[PDB]
Amino acid sequence: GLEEAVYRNIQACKELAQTTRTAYGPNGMNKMVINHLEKLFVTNDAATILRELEVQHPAAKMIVMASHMQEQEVGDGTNFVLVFAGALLELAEELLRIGLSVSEVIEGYEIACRKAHEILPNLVCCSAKNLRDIDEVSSLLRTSIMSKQYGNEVFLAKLIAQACVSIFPDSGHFNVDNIRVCKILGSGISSSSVLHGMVFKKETEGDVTSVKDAKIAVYSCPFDGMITETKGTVLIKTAEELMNFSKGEENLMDAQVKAIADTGANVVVTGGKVADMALHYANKYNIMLVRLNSKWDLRRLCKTVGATALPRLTPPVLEEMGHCDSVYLSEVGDTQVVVFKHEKEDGAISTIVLRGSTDNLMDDIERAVDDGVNTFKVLTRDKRLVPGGGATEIELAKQITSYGETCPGLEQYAIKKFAEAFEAIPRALAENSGVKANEVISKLYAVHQEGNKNVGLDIEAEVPAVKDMLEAGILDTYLGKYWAIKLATNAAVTVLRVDQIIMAKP
Amino acid sequence: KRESGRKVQSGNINAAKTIADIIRTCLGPKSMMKMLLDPMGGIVMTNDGNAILREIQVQHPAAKSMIEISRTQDEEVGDGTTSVIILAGEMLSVAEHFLEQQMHPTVVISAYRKALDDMISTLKKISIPVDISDSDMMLNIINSSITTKAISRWSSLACNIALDAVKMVQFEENGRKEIDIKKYARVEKIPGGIIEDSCVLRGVMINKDVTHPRMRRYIKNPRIVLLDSSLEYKKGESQTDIEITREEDFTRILQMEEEYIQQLCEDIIQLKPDVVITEKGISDLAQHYLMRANITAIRRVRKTDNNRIARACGARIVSRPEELREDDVGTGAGLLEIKKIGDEYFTFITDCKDPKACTILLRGASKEILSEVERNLQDAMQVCRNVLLDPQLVPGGGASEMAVAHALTEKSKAMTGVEQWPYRAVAQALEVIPRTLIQNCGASTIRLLTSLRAKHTQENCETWGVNGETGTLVDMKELGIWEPLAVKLQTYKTAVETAVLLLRIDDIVSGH
Amino acid sequence: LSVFGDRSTGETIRSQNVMAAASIANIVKSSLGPVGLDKMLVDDIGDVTITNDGATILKLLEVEHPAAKVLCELADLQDKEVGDGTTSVVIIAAELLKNADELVKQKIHPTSVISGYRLACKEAVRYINENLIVNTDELGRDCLINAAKTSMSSKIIGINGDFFANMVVDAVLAIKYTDIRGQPRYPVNSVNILKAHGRSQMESMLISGYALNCVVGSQGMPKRIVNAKIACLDFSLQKTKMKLGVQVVITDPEKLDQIRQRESDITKERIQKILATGANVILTTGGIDDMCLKYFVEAGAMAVRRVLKRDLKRIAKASGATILSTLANLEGEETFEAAMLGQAEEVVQERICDDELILIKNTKARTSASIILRGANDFMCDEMERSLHDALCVVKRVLESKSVVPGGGAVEAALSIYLENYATSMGSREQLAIAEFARSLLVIPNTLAVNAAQDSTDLVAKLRAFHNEAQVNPERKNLKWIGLDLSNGKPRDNKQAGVFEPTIVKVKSLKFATEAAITILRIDDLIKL
Numbered sequence A: 001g002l003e004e005a006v007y008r009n010i011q012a013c014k015e016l017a018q019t020t021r022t023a024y025g026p027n028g029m030n031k032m033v034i035n036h037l038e039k040l041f042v043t044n045d046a047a048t049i050l051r052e053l054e055v056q057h058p059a060a061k062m063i064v065m066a067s068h069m070q071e072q073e074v075g076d077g078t079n080f081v082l083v084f085a086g087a088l089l090e091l092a093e094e095l096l097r098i099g100l101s102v103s104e105v106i107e108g109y110e111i112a113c114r115k116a117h118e119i120l121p122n123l124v125c126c127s128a129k130n131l132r133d134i135d136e137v138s139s140l141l142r143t144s145i146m147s148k149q150y151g152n153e154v155f156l157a158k159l160i161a162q163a164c165v166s167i168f169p170d171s172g173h174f175n176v177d178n179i180r181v182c183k184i185l186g187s188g189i190s191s192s193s194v195l196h197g198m199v200f201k202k203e204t205e206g207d208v209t210s211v212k213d214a215k216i217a218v219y220s221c222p223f224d225g226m227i228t229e230t231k232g233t234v235l236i237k238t239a240e241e242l243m244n245f246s247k248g249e250e251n252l253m254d255a256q257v258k259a260i261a262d263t264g265a266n267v268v269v270t271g272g273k274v275a276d277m278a279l280h281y282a283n284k285y286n287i288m289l290v291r292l293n294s295k296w297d298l299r300r301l302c303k304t305v306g307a308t309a310l311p312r313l314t315p316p317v318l319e320e321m322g323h324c325d326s327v328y329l330s331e332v333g334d335t336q337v338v339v340f341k342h343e344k345e346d347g348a349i350s351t352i353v354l355r356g357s358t359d360n361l362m363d364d365i366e367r368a369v370d371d372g373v374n375t376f377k378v379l380t381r382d383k384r385l386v387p388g389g390g391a392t393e394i395e396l397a398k399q400i401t402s403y404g405e406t407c408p409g410l411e412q413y414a415i416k417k418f419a420e421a422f423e424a425i426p427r428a429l430a431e432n433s434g435v436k437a438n439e440v441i442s443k444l445y446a447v448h449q450e451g452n453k454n455v456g457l458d459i460e461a462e463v464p465a466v467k468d469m470l471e472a473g474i475l476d477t478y479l480g481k482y483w484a485i486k487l488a489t490n491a492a493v494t495v496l497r498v499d500q501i502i503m504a505k506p
Numbered sequence B: 001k002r003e004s005g006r007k008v009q010s011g012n013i014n015a016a017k018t019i020a021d022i023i024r025t026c027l028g029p030k031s032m033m034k035m036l037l038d039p040m041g042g043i044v045m046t047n048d049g050n051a052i053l054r055e056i057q058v059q060h061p062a063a064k065s066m067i068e069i070s071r072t073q074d075e076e077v078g079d080g081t082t083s084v085i086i087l088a089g090e091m092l093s094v095a096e097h098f099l100e101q102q103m104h105p106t107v108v109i110s111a112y113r114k115a116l117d118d119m120i121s122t123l124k125k126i127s128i129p130v131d132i133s134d135s136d137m138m139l140n141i142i143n144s145s146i147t148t149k150a151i152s153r154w155s156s157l158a159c160n161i162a163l164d165a166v167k168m169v170q171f172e173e174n175g176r177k178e179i180d181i182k183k184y185a186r187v188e189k190i191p192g193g194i195i196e197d198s199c200v201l202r203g204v205m206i207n208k209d210v211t212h213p214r215m216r217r218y219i220k221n222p223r224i225v226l227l228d229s230s231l232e233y234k235k236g237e238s239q240t241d242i243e244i245t246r247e248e249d250f251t252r253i254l255q256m257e258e259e260y261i262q263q264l265c266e267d268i269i270q271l272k273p274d275v276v277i278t279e280k281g282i283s284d285l286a287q288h289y290l291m292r293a294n295i296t297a298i299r300r301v302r303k304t305d306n307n308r309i310a311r312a313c314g315a316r317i318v319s320r321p322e323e324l325r326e327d328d329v330g331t332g333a334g335l336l337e338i339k340k341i342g343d344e345y346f347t348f349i350t351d352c353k354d355p356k357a358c359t360i361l362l363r364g365a366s367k368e369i370l371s372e373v374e375r376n377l378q379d380a381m382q383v384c385r386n387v388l389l390d391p392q393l394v395p396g397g398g399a400s401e402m403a404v405a406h407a408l409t410e411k412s413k414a415m416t417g418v419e420q421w422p423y424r425a426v427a428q429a430l431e432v433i434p435r436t437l438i439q440n441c442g443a444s445t446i447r448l449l450t451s452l453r454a455k456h457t458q459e460n461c462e463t464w465g466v467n468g469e470t471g472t473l474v475d476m477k478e479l480g481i482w483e484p485l486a487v488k489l490q491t492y493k494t495a496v497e498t499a500v501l502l503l504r505i506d507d508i509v510s511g512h
Numbered sequence C: 001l002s003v004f005g006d007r008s009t010g011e012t013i014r015s016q017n018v019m020a021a022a023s024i025a026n027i028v029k030s031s032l033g034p035v036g037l038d039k040m041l042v043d044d045i046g047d048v049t050i051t052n053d054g055a056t057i058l059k060l061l062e063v064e065h066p067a068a069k070v071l072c073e074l075a076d077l078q079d080k081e082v083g084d085g086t087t088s089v090v091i092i093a094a095e096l097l098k099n100a101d102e103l104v105k106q107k108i109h110p111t112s113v114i115s116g117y118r119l120a121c122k123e124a125v126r127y128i129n130e131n132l133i134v135n136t137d138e139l140g141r142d143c144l145i146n147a148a149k150t151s152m153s154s155k156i157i158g159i160n161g162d163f164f165a166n167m168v169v170d171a172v173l174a175i176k177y178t179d180i181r182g183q184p185r186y187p188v189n190s191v192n193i194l195k196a197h198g199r200s201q202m203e204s205m206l207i208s209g210y211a212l213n214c215v216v217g218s219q220g221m222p223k224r225i226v227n228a229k230i231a232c233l234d235f236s237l238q239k240t241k242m243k244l245g246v247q248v249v250i251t252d253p254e255k256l257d258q259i260r261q262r263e264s265d266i267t268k269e270r271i272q273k274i275l276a277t278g279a280n281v282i283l284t285t286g287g288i289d290d291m292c293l294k295y296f297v298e299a300g301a302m303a304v305r306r307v308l309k310r311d312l313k314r315i316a317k318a319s320g321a322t323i324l325s326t327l328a329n330l331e332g333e334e335t336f337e338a339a340m341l342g343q344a345e346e347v348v349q350e351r352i353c354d355d356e357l358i359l360i361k362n363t364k365a366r367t368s369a370s371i372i373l374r375g376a377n378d379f380m381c382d383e384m385e386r387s388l389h390d391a392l393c394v395v396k397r398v399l400e401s402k403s404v405v406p407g408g409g410a411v412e413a414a415l416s417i418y419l420e421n422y423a424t425s426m427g428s429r430e431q432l433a434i435a436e437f438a439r440s441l442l443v444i445p446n447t448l449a450v451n452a453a454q455d456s457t458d459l460v461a462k463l464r465a466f467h468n469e470a471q472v473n474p475e476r477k478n479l480k481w482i483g484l485d486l487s488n489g490k491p492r493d494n495k496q497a498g499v500f501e502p503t504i505v506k507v508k509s510l511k512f513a514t515e516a517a518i519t520i521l522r523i524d525d526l527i528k529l
């Protein structure tokens, strides 16, 4: 009942690498994933794969828990962890079959990890010029939106560029929470735009198109028949007693909307449905009524202006209301939306509205937009850029093998295997593009031998050659490559450190 | 029954890997033993790699090619034959670049044959010239093969036997300097005596016994007559028998048989010989005339034996006994002797010349000691054969396998193309020869092989091998594990020739 | 029903006949081309033979199936017709059956497939014969020198390709002789390739004549002779015997002596009749007597002894002389004057290192020559001799058959475009028969691309992209006669590379493969007894 007992901890992580190796790159394949609520979904993002695939082996859960740390401090390269650290554990199995101990590979990996953190600042070619221009920003964002939505990057690189420039004067406060995404059904991606302030997809149900009131109250309860918090035994016998309750319901709701006018609040948000007679009372006292059925659309407004959602039927409470500058309506893309604009304030809220005919298609654009904001959320720190497309993966594999050859002793075996694990990432890019991977690696090492740096893969099915990444405009993030190498090495050293797994009762 | 596709290429890998895994630990003088079970219940515990794989029956036809090619390897050299099969298995064991990288075999073959000329030129660079005239230098070279044997107590005598045998067979007047052990170095055994009594006869010895006592026993000036046809009545073109029924017909056939037999004997005794050596048999009536003239009658010799006798005393091979001339005199020979030494007759016609041949005289107290000295001296003559063919030595013990594999790593940096990935696979497959020497001694394999490669990248590549006995590193210039170049070149040529043979095989087809 | 076996009919015998025939194509799929892979031929005894030649594969392949037994006989119709082509018929006809098997499932009767295949085959010969090349360009214009240089690239001779390709081009054009009504062909016998140690491989010389590897012996006899008479004989001038197995009886001792004096006296009589003819070139297989060589150094006859028998058959064919087996003319002894003698111009004993050779010049009718492969050792000379023999047969088999065609995938790629446009011109339930005939011809570059370790979807499509432009517009910017270089993995012109194939190996391959695919497609019922 025991065969190897050290190989089964690695084979569980090799299956986790295979679910994202073919899904790597701009030529990567999509995944037909099934939601837990029985919903069909088509995506190719690496973070949405692990969220739905409930992996159960705890040896492969270390790389998944490393992906949750990969989502922190950087929003770039979750697929880089599942490919590179998967190639670390696959190449480490060739050393253990010879007779090498597992503790010798551990100290040899941490030696080559600190050596790879010194060669990576030497490969920084360009940097951002901090001009806050749409030509400088969209030139670097065109590589990050690639490998998410290929072919439609010409419309996505300009829209997120117009959102992040409006936040860059607010220095030290740029984040992904300031740029929100609201999806509106429409024609396609060509009709999409970008707006300022908080934009919701639902229009104002009332007849007010513009109001300058600051007091905003949110009530999650729908507009229906009022129920007393006490017992409240209400009995009806005849038709005249039913009309006394029907007219008395409208008369009490007339005093309910009058309490909103007494506190000086002309903006009300209702989570549930609104009755037709209660909608007439809101338009009488010039009150803007916006219906928001989504709970995440209601929770977004409490964390911005402070207006809380109360369960009671319109309570006149002055303490739990929010504050905004100007709430109005705007007609963009043949659809009226509500804008929570900040006129007196300088403003740091931007909303990118996305249009599309398929909800399964518009959700993949939302993961491509939030990964585009997270590329420049990293660039609020020290600006360093590295060439992409497998350009840095060969030069880092060239210097480590040159370093491990000159170093004598038993530690030269784990350093040489640390460089060949970087070769799997151009092997993942060449295989997904329909090109023989053994020819591109030989074409990459032949041009890097002569000193022609910044050379990556030519993205073409018919051309197995290479091209320059500096003239092509392909650039990655150095901090995106810095935390990816450190977290994948710390994850792959954790799986090799654990030998056997024993179940225990609580 | 029939296989096609990539299962044959992966099937030929495991067919050759299971042969190399049998004799993987059978390398070096610290080799381990094996257990061979017989269907009769017996067990032979031999440690010879040629004897292990010969009795093993195999069913894969690709595994059949590993034995019959190595059977031809025993006829060429007699040393290092198990090192070929380990190199044949390790060259085909790296199946990652074979099938898992989707590479065609023509890519691997064009890289393996481009590794062959780099494996040949590197072995000629680390060589050393040999002073063949000194006998003390040729004593230490046979010590790698005479050790762990019973002839180690008489190593000075066995060195003198193999050196004088290889120098007489070598006919260097043609330029090519051919050596023929199977033809001109016929080894014979003499029962009785001790191992120290063994010597080398300067000529040809014939194991023909003595039938009639009226023969020449000790003649100082022998006269050898070499013939091809037999001494009997002349038959026709067919093989029909002459039956006799009438009584008068018995006198007619017998008088022409008596006249033809005595005529073929009377023209031999006109030269007054001492020993008659003919190719075919001798009849009973011819033996009556041979014992009348009191001469030795020798029959049943080969055509190769008749060529060496005629060059020993200056005789000439004549087909018929009625056409002999005055040139067929065996003068100049040393002595004639048919003395029964150890219950066996031996014909001594030795002399003081070099007729491109020799004869080894084996002595021993029993047949068990005579069988031990025969197989041990045959390996001694094959080592000195490769020395006189090309006086160049390569240091063994893993020093040659690390000197070449260090050059293949340096040459792989400037070798562009897709073939550079299996080009490094030949260098790592050559490291299995010093790998198993650490495994057979008992030291740590990966701990000592890493420091072995670090000694080759800095210092000279002709030095710092692996001592299989003590287990540690030693210099090859201090201890004599020097192997010939013709053995190491024939090993590396055959290991590529069997790697190019099994990799070309794509389909297995049965039928005639 | 009670019969003497099992009966099976329908389309299930059509699908079983094409699966048994295409499995034989997989036996000869990887072995196609000069880079073909070896395959093991397991015998019933237990031994195995490693052969890669496809003609020897199908001879030893024994499949007890009647569908596979049909493809066995076309190997006998291929060697008896031309001598080459064999496995290219098998891959074409099996892919013809596999595409026609898809037509049976697509509600097409095979009768339209059989009649459509014969019209597709006859139009294939018409498009081939309209795009041929006459056998010419022997001197002055290269598609030759470069033609033999590709065959010479696999060995160590390919370092200096231009030096050794000139030795085989002028040797092929030297052995040309019509001999029947203006045929000209090339004989199976060729130049004799000798070797020597001329301190490097660059000292090879193109000798315009046969060179004998024999040494004349004595030096007092002059080595330069001017006379034309050449004598060839097989009987020994040494002491003769009756038979190797039958002997004459010698009883008296003085009788033995007088037959040796007669042997010394009858050798004086035979040399009087040989030198009376004036023949100085004396070549004897059985050897020359020692006192007989004394008479030749004073008369000036160039006597050579211990000559090989197969070398003398090319010498007697050179000067037009007759080989004399016995000198006794059934009652006495004569020399057969003016019968066994030829004519020549000059025989010089050239000083060649380690073998002083005998060269003959301007004989009666020889047309042969010799190449002295001077080198450094026996390793480089033995591999260069088989390289010259392999390069000789490449230029020989092309320049025989009276017109040639650029082959190596250039024939079938051009036929895949013309036969598709011809298929759209007929109709009448045979358009799919010719359109699948064009796609079935594409397996010849498809198996050649997978054996050249290249991408088969790119290398075959690069052949059809160039051959389509020759049919669209007749402008010279269109690449025409584009072959397939399997070494570099890039298509090139066959006129520049010199890759040529005979027309009779290309015509009879398309003729035999369609007639073999017709016979298997006509099988609709199986009867066993």
Ligand SMILES: Nc1ncnc2c1ncn2[C@@H]1O[C@H](COP(=O)(O)OP(=O)(O)OP(=O)(O)O)[C@@H](O)[C@H]1O
Residues within 6 Å of the ligand: A024, A025, A026, A045, A046, A047, A075, A076, A077, A078, A079, A080, A144, A146, A147, A148, A371, A387, A388, A389, A390, A391, A456, A457, A459, A474, A476
């Ligand atoms: N078109 C391209 N040109 C050059 N390099 C590319 C291209 N597309 C992807 N890459 C390379 O792929 C790696 C990042 O690719 P990818 O966009 O798949 O990661 P990611 O999907 O952003 O990670 P995450 O899953 O966290 O979003 C980088 O090393 C980059 O060099």
Ligand SMILES: Nc1ncnc2c1ncn2[C@@H]1O[C@H](COP(=O)(O)OP(=O)(O)OP(=O)(O)O)[C@@H](O)[C@H]1O
Residues within 6 Å of the ligand: B026, B027, B028, B029, B049, B078, B079, B080, B081, B082, B083, B144, B395, B396, B397, B398, B399, B466, B467, B468, B469, B481
């Ligand atoms: N005394 C020794 N000390 C160290 N190494 C040795 C010694 N003798 C032999 N070797 C090593 O062993 C290798 C040969 O191994 P092995 O003895 O199995 O082959 P062999 O028996 O000599 O030849 P063959 O196997 O064909 O008979 C040589 O390369 C040499 O370096």
Ligand SMILES: Nc1ncnc2c1ncn2[C@@H]1O[C@H](COP(=O)(O)OP(=O)(O)OP(=O)(O)O)[C@@H](O)[C@H]1O
Residues within 6 Å of the ligand: C031, C032, C033, C034, C036, C054, C055, C078, C083, C084, C085, C086, C087, C088, C089, C407, C408, C409, C444, C448, C484, C485, C486, C499, C500
């Ligand atoms: N010089 C050349 N260059 C490129 N391809 C060639 C050349 N010569 C031959 N070929 C190709 O090789 C194939 C010949 O394969 P092979 O010689 O292995 O068997 P075969 O001769 O077809 O069998 P058979 O003897 O029945 O006809 C031909 O189809 C041809 O296209």
